[PDB]
């Protein structure tokens, strides 16, 4: 057993991922 | 991705000779696994190739010249069904490729966002 | 104590049981699941007999709250409540002894 993950659960993990995806997307297309 | 019905699809040379020799229709098969109204296309490169299979394949030619299927034109003397489509799939992002040729199929999986087909109207996503 | 407003419908004269049957409607905004005792008090003042001449039961409330519908009874006399009512309701209302066995 490890105390390593602190990362959120359920809905809050999907919100952050979407924001990161949008940021990544802005660069390559722009 | 932003692709909407009615879909538009490109019928190359390898497709029709897998349709008749498995007795599955062109247009009515395309309405099956795409589940909407389909707009088939054939280019000048593909049709004039089938005149060279003429005395053994009148059957494929007399099906392709039906008003269910539409006319499409390109302007190059010497191009193929194989290479002329890849330029069509390149400069626009809203066609669907129908084929079974693996030599063409590896040129389709590289460009993202391009729908493929299968054995005669049994579709598969990108 | 929020202007209880007990509404009655379906009143039929039943003289062969010497009674009047009617559906009690209990509107209760900002008040939840009032009683069986206060209901017998507050519908006996439109018929003007007595509290123990009034029987009532039923009352599955509306979902969420604010309305309650049961089934109500009124008789002509006190002795009729001792004859025409069921034996456990009189124990429930208080008008009898339940001989446990």
């Amino acid at each position: 057993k490890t105390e390593k993950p602190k990362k959120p659960k359920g809905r809050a993990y999907k919100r952050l991922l979407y924001t990161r995806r949008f940021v990544n997307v802005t660069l390559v297309n722009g | 991705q932003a692709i909407k019905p009615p879909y538009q699809v490109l019928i190359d040379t390898n497709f029709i000779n897998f349709s008749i020799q498995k007795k599955v229709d062109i247009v009515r098969g395309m309405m099956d696994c795409l589940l909407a109204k389909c707009n088939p296309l054939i280019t000048d490169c593909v049709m004039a190739e089938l005149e060279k299979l003429g005395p053994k394949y009148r059957i494929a030619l007399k099906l392709a010249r039906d008003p269910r299927i539409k006319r499409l034109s390109c302007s190059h003397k010497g191009t193929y069904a194989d290479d002329c489509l890849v330029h069509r799939v390149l400069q626009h992002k809203c066609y669907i490729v129908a084929t079974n040729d693996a030599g063409l199929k590896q040129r389709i999986r590289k460009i993202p966002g391009i729908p493929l087909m299968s054995v005669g109207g049994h579709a598969y996503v990108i | 104590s929020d202007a209880v407003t007990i509404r009655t419908r379906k009143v039929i004269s039943n003289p062969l049981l010497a009674r009047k049957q009617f559906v009690v409607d209990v509107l209760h905004p900002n008040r939840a699941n009032v009683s069986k005792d206060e209901l017998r008090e507050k519908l006996a003042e439109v018929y003007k007999a007595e509290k123990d001449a009034v029987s009532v039961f039923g009352f599955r409330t509306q979902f969420g709250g604010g309305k309650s519908v049961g089934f109500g009874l009124v008789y002509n006399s006190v002795a009729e409540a001792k004859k025409f009512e069921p034996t456990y309701r009189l124990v429930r209302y208080g008008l009898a002894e339940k001989v446990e066995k």
Binding site: - | - | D2, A3, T5, R9, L27, P29
Partner: protein, 365 residues
């Protein structure tokens, strides 16, 4: 009950007694008259209720008592109105009369000493009172509300009964009879609905007949329905509505379509038809009175077969925006609340004879 009083022919219309009173208020919104001696109650956009005695038919309404609020009653549990009062309704026992308006409250008043006996918060920022209508010989208040609601109260006990939902714009007009049902309009949704209170059901009748088809009529031989302004209930089996283009629609409870629609009534003046700004029927009769700002109350007689209606006439004694019609009897006394503008605070154009007051008209037999 059905229509049985047949006296449209008995009305002597051409020599009806016409008179007018000027009053000390700007923009009277409504008028409500009690019949058990007869009383009258007026509210204005000058924040005032005024009580008149109208038991003497030959006289103009003389002043009994009057009450005006002010800016003291800014909060909403204050016992006074602090904005425009849009409607007023008297209780059938002659004991109370309730007012309400843009201050989004309901203040029940005593008829005797003219005192605020009750104030009720509507508890919504969009719960503006628009029309109050009492069931005949009852105390169950039907409250049209601007948050698309119908709120039902009791008067003697001052409680809340239940609320009807369903409309899509602001419920302007609601009318009722002695049974437990009412007619409502939503006044931009271009429909009307019948409301059965214990059944908790509605029957939805649809206007919005396109004038384009009427242009087909123009090939066989107009103006748009945009706002069903008023609704009135003649009997328990039929009713009527008034529109924004002169059409007055007769409706049957067995007919989804309009069983009749009258084309342009108060007329026009590209061109602009007058609005049907008032509509009041004599109960269980075949006679009803429609009013505009055009200057003449047009009165109509329902046919016996409930299929069409015909002109009784015009009464030209009332110039200005007719907001509300009251009719009492014994003979008949007609009162009309004439304001300088429309009820809803709306804009009015170039009105000849800008005046404020009460129209009276006595018709014999």
């Amino acid at each position: 009950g059905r229509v049985f009083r047949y006296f449209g022919d008995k009305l002597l219309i051409s020599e009806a007694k016409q008179s007018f009173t000027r009053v000390g208020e700007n923009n009277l919104t409504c008028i409500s008259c009690f019949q058990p001696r007869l009383f009258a109650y007026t509210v204005s956009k000058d924040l005032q209720l005024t009580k008149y005695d109208i038991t003497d038919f030959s006289k103009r309404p003389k002043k009994l008592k009057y009450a005006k609020g002010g800016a003291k009653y800014i909060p909403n549990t204050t016992e006074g109105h602090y904005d425009e009062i849009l409607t007023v309704a008297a209780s059938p026992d002659g004991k109370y009369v309730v007012t309400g308006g843009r201050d989004r409250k309901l203040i029940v008043w005593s008829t005797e000493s003219l005192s605020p006996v009750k104030v009720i918060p509507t508890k919504d920022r969009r719960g503006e009172v628009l029309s109050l209508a009492f069931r005949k010989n009852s105390d169950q208040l039907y409250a049209s509300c601007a948050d698309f609601k119908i709120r039902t109260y009791s008067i003697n006990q001052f409680s809340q009964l239940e609320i009807l939902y369903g409309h899509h714009d602001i419920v302007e007009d609601i009318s009722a009879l002695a049974m437990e049902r009412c007619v409502t309009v939503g006044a931009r949704d271009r429909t009307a609905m019948l409301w059965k209170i214990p059944d908790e059901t509605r029957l939805t009748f649809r206007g919005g007949d396109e004038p384009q088809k009427l242009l087909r009529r123009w090939m066989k031989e107009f103006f748009c329905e945009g706002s069903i302004d008023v609704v009135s209930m003649v009997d328990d089996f039929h009713f009527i509505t008034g529109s924004d283009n002169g059409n007055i629609c007769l409706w049957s409870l067995a007919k989804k379509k309009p069983i009749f629609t009258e084309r342009i009534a108060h007329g026009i003046l590209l061109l602009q038809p007058f609005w049907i700004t008032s509509l009041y029927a004599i109960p269980y009769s075949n006679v009803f009175i429609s009013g505009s700002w055009s200057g003449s109350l047009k009165v109509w007689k329902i046919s016996d077969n409930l299929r069409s209606f015909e002109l009784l006439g015009e009464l030209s004694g009332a110039k200005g925006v007719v907001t509300k019609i009251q009719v009492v009897e014994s003979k008949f006394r007609i009162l009309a609340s004439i304001a300088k503008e429309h009820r809803l605070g709306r804009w009015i154009a170039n009105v000849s004879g800008a005046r404020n007051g009460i129209y009276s008209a006595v018709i014999d037999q």
